[PDB]
């Protein structure tokens, strides 16, 4: 029995939510159930609407001032609760019993294929609120929906839509390429793989690279990089890349020789703090959050969904230096991308509010 109460700046309205992280099972999102406690004497026959909002915050580089972010709604839901016109939940029943008759429950259904709470990593020169997808619960006292919402009689509470790692392990990632360098002498074979499909945050990613060279060229270097893909659709569908981990190895493969090694790299935020625009997980206010989890989407998906979609790939690159007709300045790189899932496993308690200086 632990619930969150936030009163209005004056103190008449108060929202009561049980959770603040609502797990998005791909079929259905957990209902945003709550309870609003009102004071008829102050309201004077007004209404108490409760709004659930999904808003994409963004910045402008044209403005002379800095930190002036904006908001761009992509889901709005409204519920009138004081004149009530899908029964209550056990938590709602308990709150109503403990608060009497002047507590009026509300519930929200978040439709599937909505974005999860993602925060883009702000730069060090930024001084405003971060960008990304943020949810919010807002209850206010207003006679009309269109009437101005004076902040004195409204309560804004941030909530996070989250996902957790699927229980069933997926197929092992694996890719292979063959490249011929304008000679057709023999195929340069590259094969890479990862041990598993789903990785938890902080765990090492074991890349088993297997190069089988048959050509007459020398593989100078092998670079393994973990890259984060962010599909942001704020105004037009875009795509971004960011290496969150990288291993540069001087391992050399001679012609007609095979090379096998297992490279281990771990993505983490310590070495990626200066990358502005990096996708992190949703932030309640301004706490430290890990790299954004992979976005799980339905097998039958509407696609092109708004907000930010996070993906991760491991890239292995062979830097082959051409010989016999150049000064080794040219380097025809053969490469391979392997996708994997980076999530948290299903918990048994609330994620946040553990440690704070």
């Amino acid at each position: 029995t632990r619930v969150f109460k936030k009163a209005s700046p004056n103190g008449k309205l108060t929202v009561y939510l049980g959770k603040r992280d609502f797990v998005d099972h791909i079929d259905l999102v957990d209902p945003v159930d709550g309870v609003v406690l009102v004071d008829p004497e102050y309201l004077k026959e007004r209404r108490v609407y409760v709004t659930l909002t999904c808003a994409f915050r963004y910045g402008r580089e044209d403005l002379d001032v800095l930190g002036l972010t904006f908001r761009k709604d992509l889901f709005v839901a409204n519920v009138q609760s004081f004149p009530p016109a899908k029964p209550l939940t056990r938590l709602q029943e308990r709150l109503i019993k403990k608060l009497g008759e002047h507590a009026y429950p509300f519930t929200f259904e978040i439709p599937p294929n909505l974005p999860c709470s993602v925060t883009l990593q702000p730069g060090p020169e930024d001084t405003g609120k971060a960008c990304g997808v943020d949810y919010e619960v807002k209850a206010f006292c207003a006679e009309n929906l269109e009437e101005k919402i004076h902040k004195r009689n409204s309560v804004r509470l941030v909530i996070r839509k989250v996902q957790y790692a699927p229980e069933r392990p997926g197929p092992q990632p694996t890719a292979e390429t063959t490249r011929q360098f304008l000679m057709s002498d023999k195929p340069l074979h590259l094969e890479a793989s990862l041990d598993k499909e789903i990785y938890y945050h902080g765990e090492p990613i074991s890349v088993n690279v297997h190069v089988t060279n048959n050509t007459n060229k020398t593989v100078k270097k092998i670079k393994i990089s973990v890259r984060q893909y962010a599909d942001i659709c704020l105004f037009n569908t875009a795509q971004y890349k960011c290496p969150v981990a990288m291993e540069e190895a001087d391992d050399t493969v001679a012609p007609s020789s095979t090379f096998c090694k297992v490279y281990t790299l771990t993505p983490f935020l310590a070495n990626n703090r200066e990358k502005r625009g990096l996708a992190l997980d949703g932030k309640l206010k301004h706490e430290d959050t890990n790299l954004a989890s992979s976005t799980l989407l339905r097998e039958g998906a509407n696609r092109e969904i708004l907000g930010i979609i996070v993906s991760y790939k491991v890239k292995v690159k062979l830097v082959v230096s051409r010989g016999g007709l150049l000064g080794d300045l040219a380097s025809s790189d053969v490469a391979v991308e392997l996708p994997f899932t980076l999530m948290h496993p299903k918990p048994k308690e609330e994620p946040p509010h553990r440690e704070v200086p």
Partner: antibody, heavy 120, light 110 residues
Framework: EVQLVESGGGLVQPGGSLRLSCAAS????????IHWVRQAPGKGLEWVAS????????YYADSVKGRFTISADTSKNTAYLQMNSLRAEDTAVYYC?????????????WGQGTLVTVSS | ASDIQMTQSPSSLSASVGDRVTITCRAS??????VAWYQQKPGKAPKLLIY???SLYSGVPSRFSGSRSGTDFTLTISSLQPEDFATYYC?????????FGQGTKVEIKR
């Protein structure tokens, strides 16, 4: 097998230096935090230093900040603690403990402990 | 939170096999449910008993149970065995200067 093995504790001169090492096993330094907790002979538990190593954080006690320094070596999966300007009140049995990095605390794994004796 | 004192009420406690004992700790300031409990045999490393002020760590026998009421916290041993003679520490982990309780020695009486 998840275990922490400590080393480097021993008798030193007052004002000297020491370097305790916590050789972790069975877990990774990026998915867990490493903390140093000491217990004076016949006294209670006390937290000294901690390192996150995923967010690159290092925390020290109010009486430890200006002398101690905790560090993590990912290659060997080991954490250290540089104890300097040691005084009399630094005598204790020092334990290194593991905590889950992501949304957990309560030190679920502990080392055996190494007694650090600081007397002239 | 300048500093938080995890004051355990009983310093020494005498009990018998099969008895029910309770150890109460008071925080100097609200720490939410960020409280853990440890069992330390003499000359050994502490063992985590319960965390989140109510949640039982895996492998710890069900006779141990913790519960929060307010700024106070409670660890319960129901029908304590002879293998429960130890010192019990309460730790709040809500803030970086993590503080433990003074400890409570639970001894067998006769």
């Amino acid at each position: 097998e998840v275990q922490l093995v400590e080393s480097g504790g021993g008798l030193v001169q007052p004002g000297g230096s020491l370097r305790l090492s916590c050789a972790a096993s069975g877990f990774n330094v990026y998915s867990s935090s490493i903390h140093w907790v000491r217990q004076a002979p016949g006294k209670g538990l006390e937290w000294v230093a901690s390192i996150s190593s995923y967010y690159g954080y290092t925390y020290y006690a109010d009486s430890v900040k200006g002398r101690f320094t905790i560090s993590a070596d990912t290659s060997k999966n080991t954490a250290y603690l540089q104890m300097n300007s040691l005084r009399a009140e630094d005598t204790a049995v020092y334990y290194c403990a593991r905590s889950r990095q992501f949304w957990y605390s309560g030190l679920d794994y502990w080392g055996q402990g190494t007694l650090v004796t600081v007397s002239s | 939170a300048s500093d938080i004192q995890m004051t355990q009420s009983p310093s020494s406690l005498s009990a018998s096999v099969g008895d029910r004992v309770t150890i109460t700790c008071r925080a100097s300031q609200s720490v939410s449910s960020a409280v853990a409990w440890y069992q330390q045999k003499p000359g050994k490393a502490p063992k985590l008993l319960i965390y989140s002020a109510s949640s039982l760590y895996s492998g710890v026998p069900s006779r141990f149970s913790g519960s929060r009421s307010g700024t106070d916290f409670t660890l319960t041993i129901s029908s304590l065995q002879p293998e429960d003679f130890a010192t019990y520490y309460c730790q709040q982990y809500k803030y970086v200067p993590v503080t433990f309780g003074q400890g409570t020695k639970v001894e067998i009486k006769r």
